[PDB]
Design a protein around this ligand. Structure first.
Ligand SMILES: *[C@@H]1O[C@H](CO[C@@H]2O[C@@H](C)[C@@H](O)[C@@H](O)[C@@H]2O)[C@@H](O[C@@H]2O[C@H](CO)[C@@H](O[C@@H]3O[C@H](CO[C@H]4O[C@H](CO)[C@@H](O)[C@H](O)[C@@H]4O)[C@@H](O)[C@H](O[C@H]4O[C@H](CO)[C@@H](O)[C@H](O)[C@@H]4O)[C@@H]3O)[C@H](O)[C@H]2NC(C)=O)[C@H](O[C@@H]2O[C@@H](C)[C@@H](O)[C@@H](O)[C@@H]2O)[C@H]1NC(C)=O
Ligand SMILES: CCCCCCCC/C=C\CCCCCCCC(=O)O[C@H](COC(=O)CCCCCCCCCCCCCCC)COP(=O)([O-])O[C@@H]1[C@H](O)[C@H](O)[C@@H](O)[C@H](O)[C@H]1O
Ligand SMILES: CCCCCCCCCCCCCCCCCCCCCCCCOC(=O)CCCCCCCCCCCCCCC
Ligand SMILES: *[C@@H]1O[C@H](CO[C@@H]2O[C@@H](C)[C@@H](O)[C@@H](O)[C@@H]2O)[C@@H](O[C@@H]2O[C@H](CO)[C@@H](O)[C@H](O)[C@H]2NC(C)=O)[C@H](O)[C@H]1NC(C)=O
Ligand SMILES: [Cl-]
Ligand SMILES: [Cl-]
Ligand SMILES: [Cl-]
Ligand SMILES: [Cl-]
Ligand SMILES: [Cl-]
Ligand SMILES: [Cl-]
Ligand code: NA
Ligand code: NA
Lengths: 281, 100
């Protein structure tokens, strides 16, 4: 099956000073947001009709409350211990936790935390592991955290028992959207290139879903190894945009074409032909 | 936990630009840290009011990213830009949209 294979929640907690902190949170299937966190209410926003997966409203409500309690207590405890942990304001903490379905069916869970944009800890084997960039501060935190009753056992349950069944239920519930095929459109443009008699040709590919795509500059059947792929950029409403570029000497552009392959095209590749002397659209 | 990262700013249209045909202008702001950021989309240097954006997310390396977008109708002479302010920037950074 195609589309996302993982679910995770993220947290960003911004500490302005000893008495002001704000947290933002959300839930994702790979890159696709399916939950928001509403700080006005301390409840989740469900962005798709199927965002609850196969969970009951009761369990969903219970999970919202765990997160609400956690979000409040996290800020409270980080503020109380900031002095011991020699923290200088302002700082920002990040977390991500979730699970992923692998080839062959295994589901693997993960939890990672960051301070100042650098890895700080992870959870391996239901245990707090300090990260080297987190230094002695992260060693102190892990030794602290494992003494708070309930925390580690709740993390363990959520990571290894709640998340996998949630993941399987929501990938199924969302399959009409998650596994749909949306065709890209492609077009050509010519950019500037440094040095005498050099052109950059650009093949734009936009509006495709799922994310895997193949784009290559070609001369006939010969794929041009100079093809350079840009970063895959997002569009609104769950599609992607991608540029593939080729640098070529002025008199060698004629004969080039751009070939696009995508799961949605049912084997009918898009082929665009570069024409010289301004005979392009 | 100390070095700040400046935004990368990429401006692009959803569809190929055709003068007089409705389209969507995207501004993808990524690679920055900390998360506090201000982003506008500009038409002829003036702020566009009906602009949507994504909820905050971040990459594997913990850098934040956001997508800002608005409906727009490109014309021959109108200019569109994405204007970003961040703690890493001494004044707003304006990045103009360009078709080619
Ligand atoms: C949301 O969906 C989850 C995913 O499964 C969905 O439901 C199934 C039925 C189909 O609709 C799928 O299309 C869909 O993906 C549900 O979780 C799954 O529930 C089933 C039970 O229905 C459960 O299967 C049991 O598995 C155990 C063995 O599990 C251990 O070992 C395996 C390796 O073999 C390992 O992967 C596991 O993690 C465990 O370590 C087995 O003993 C059970 O056998 C008993 O029951 C069957 C009848 O089903 C009977 O034939 C046997 O003889 C024996 O009595 C049974 O096969 C899945 O393992 C589980 N999957 C995961 C990843 O958790 C989920 O169901 C709820 O949670 C479950 C943990 C369980 O408590 C259910 O009773 C719950 O309703 C569902 N709902 C929610 C709210 O999460
Ligand atoms: C919509 C679908 C969603 C799908 C979602 C799918 C799954 C998503 C996957 C993964 C999520 C993982 C992250 C979960 C984070 C919250 C866990 C938690 O602790 O819950 C909370 C525990 O309490 C607190 O946190 C109170 C504040 C204390 C300080 C907190 C500092 C935390 C720092 C460490 C963080 C890193 C983590 C540790 C790193 C090592 C809330 O749980 P509770 O209120 O139900 O209580 C509990 C509760 O009452 C118990 O029953 C009781 O036994 C217990 O004593 C009590 O504490
Ligand atoms: C004992 C405290 C010591 C504090 C002082 C030291 C400070 C520096 C240390 C920094 C520690 C960083 C660790 C961070 C770990 C956090 C990882 C947890 C990630 C998961 C949190 C999710 C919350 C958001 O919830 C949602 O959005 C859920 C929405 C869908 C569900 C409904
Ligand atoms: C801790 O900081 C808050 C201010 O929050 C931020 O302050 C700036 C640095 C900037 O990030 C702003 O966007 C934020 O608002 C202080 O609370 C403020 O207090 C002043 C007067 O004391 C008041 O005018 C503001 O309304 C308050 N902020 C809010 C959001 O209401 C707070 O006083 C600081 N604490 C200490 C001990 O200095
Ligand atoms: Cl995808
Ligand atoms: Cl609250
Ligand atoms: Cl809240
Ligand atoms: Cl589910
Ligand atoms: Cl402008
Ligand atoms: Cl500057
Ligand atoms: Na606070
Ligand atoms: Na040149």
């Amino acid at each position: 099956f195609q589309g996302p294979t993982s679910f995770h929640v993220i947290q960003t907690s911004s500490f302005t000073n000893s008495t002001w902190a704000q947290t933002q949170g959300s839930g994702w299937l790979d890159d696709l947001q399916i939950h928001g966190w509403d700080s006005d209410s301390g409840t989740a926003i469900f962005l798709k009709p199927w965002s609850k997966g196969n969970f009951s409203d009761k369990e969903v409500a219970e999970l919202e409350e765990i997160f609400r309690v956690y979000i409040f207590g996290f800020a409270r405890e980080v503020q109380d211990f900031a002095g011991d942990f020699q923290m200088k304001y302002p700082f920002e903490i990040q977390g991500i936790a979730g699970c992923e379905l692998h080839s062959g069916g295994a589901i693997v869970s993960f939890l990672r935390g960051a301070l100042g944009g650098l890895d700080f800890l992870s959870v391996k084997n239901a245990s707090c592991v300090p990260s080297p960039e987190g230094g002695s501060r992260a060693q102190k935190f892990c030794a602290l955290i494992i003494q708070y009753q309930g925390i580690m056992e709740t993390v363990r349950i959520l990571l290894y028992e709640t998340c996998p069944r949630y993941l399987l239920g929501v990938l199924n519930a969302g399959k009409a959207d998650l596994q749909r095929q949306v065709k890209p459109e492609a077009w050509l443009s010519s950019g500037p290139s440094p040095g005498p008699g050099r052109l950059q040709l650009v093949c734009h590919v936009s509006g495709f879903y799922p994310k895997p795509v193949w784009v290559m500059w070609m001369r006939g059947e010969q794929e041009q190894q100079g093809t350079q792929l840009g970063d895959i950029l997002p569009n609104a409403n769950w599609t992607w945009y991608l540029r593939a570029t080729l640098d070529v000497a002025d008199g060698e552009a004629a004969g080039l074409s751009c070939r696009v392959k995508h799961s949605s095209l049912e084997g009918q590749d898009i082929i665009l032909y570069w024409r010289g002397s301004g005979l392009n659209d | 936990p100390k070095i700040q990262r400046t935004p990368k700013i990429q401006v692009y249209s959803r569809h190929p630009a055709e003068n007089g045909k409705s389209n969507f202008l995207n501004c993808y702001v990524s690679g920055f840290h900390p998360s506090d950021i201000e982003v506008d989309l500009l038409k002829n240097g003036e702020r566009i009011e009906k602009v949507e954006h994504s909820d905050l997310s971040f990459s594997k390396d913990w850098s934040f990213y956001l997508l800002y977008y608005t409906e727009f109708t490109p014309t021959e002479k109108d200019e569109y830009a994405c204007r970003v302010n961040h703690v890493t920037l001494s004044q707003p950074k304006i990045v103009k949209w360009d078709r080619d």
